From a paper:
Using a differential scanning fluorimetry (DSF) assay in an RT-PCR instrument we screened a fragment library of 505 molecules identifying 16 molecules that significantly increase the thermal melting point of the purified periplasmic domain of TraE. Whereas docking predictions are increasingly reliable, the design of inhibitors requires high-resolution structural information and towards this goal we soaked TraE crystals with the binding fragments. Surprisingly, molecule 1E6 (2-furoic acid) bound to two sites on TraE. The first binding site is in the inhibitor-binding surface groove, whereas the second molecule binds to an α-helical region at the dimerization site of VirB8-like proteins as was predicted by docking. To our surprise, molecule 1E6 also binds to an alternative site that is close to the dimer interface of VirB8-like proteins. The discovery of this novel binding site opens additional opportunities for the design of small molecules that inhibit the functions of VirB8-like proteins. Since both fragments bind in close proximity we reasoned that combining them may generate small molecules with higher affinity. In silico docking predicted that all these molecules bind to one or both of the 1E6 binding sites observed by X-ray crystallography. Addition of the fragments as well as of the derived small molecules that do not stabilize the protein in the DSF assay at concentrations of 50 μM has no effect on conjugation.
The conjugative transfer of plasmids between Gram-negative bacteria is mediated by type IV secretion system (T4SS) and many pathogens such as Helicobacter pylori, Bartonella and Brucella species use this strategy for the transfer of virulence factors into mammalian cells. T4SS typically comprise 12 membrane-associated proteins that fall into three categories: cytoplasmic ATPases (VirB4, VirB11 and VirD4), surface-exposed pilus components (VirB2 and VirB5) and core components associated with the inner and/or the outer membrane (VirB1, VirB3, VirB6, VirB7, VirB8, VirB9 and VirB10). Here, we conducted a fragment-based screen to identify novel chemical entities that bind to and may identify novel druggable sites on TraE and other VirB8-like proteins. Also, our data demonstrate the existence of two potential druggable sites on TraE.
Residue numbers in the entry:
A (entry chain D): 94 to 230
B (entry chain A): 88 to 230
Write the structure that this text describes.
Amino acid sequence: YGDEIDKFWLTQYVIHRESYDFYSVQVDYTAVGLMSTPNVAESYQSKFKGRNGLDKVLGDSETTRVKINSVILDKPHGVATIRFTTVRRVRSNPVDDQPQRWIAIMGYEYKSLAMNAEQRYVNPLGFRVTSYRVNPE
Amino acid sequence: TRDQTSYGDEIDKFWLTQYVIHRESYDFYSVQVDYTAVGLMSTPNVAESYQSKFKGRNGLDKVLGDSETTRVKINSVILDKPHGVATIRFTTVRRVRSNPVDDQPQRWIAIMGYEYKSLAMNAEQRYVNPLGFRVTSYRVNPE
């Protein structure tokens, strides 16, 4: 669909998935779902299982924000690499935690299937992640 | 592919900032791409006003060529999704290739009207403007 369009969804995916804010985890959880193959999807849903679920554990005690630093592409393969930075924030503390720099190896593709009302505000192009992996530097 | 004013905050912002970058940047290496993009992402009236500076012997790319470049930096975006209106503040940094350093930055405000339209679209057209985003009004002023 073009590089800049590819970079948008990819970065929005990282932001959606690697961020934590309680009052927006529900839409974030939804986006990651639509933007992921079911097997890649429920590998992430593992964070939200039982009553030890991330949102159900952390509650609103803290928040983690994401910062996109760079985005390289490999268009034919449908592969991309995203370096990003996370900053955790405990609401009780007076200061942000020290940043953490990560790398995200991603595979992606496009298949606009069941065009639904609540999808076309999230993934209109049918962007989906095929392989997601994250590591530090 | 579907008539609607908005696609939400983050999707609207993407196209809008992409439009400003395409339209307010100048890079000879990418101008053909930028020029096509603005054309597809514009109503005919917005398009014709923009395309005007490229027509003729003194067409911008015919005059400037690769002698210089201007890059854009988006500072902020304020959406009014219900009415398809947006305000974008951005900075341009011009570089004349015959100078050792860049020009001083300039600050601008873009008042924009936008929408999405379902229209007939070929292969390499959908590849640039899949959702049929287009600017319906556009005026830039200095900060």
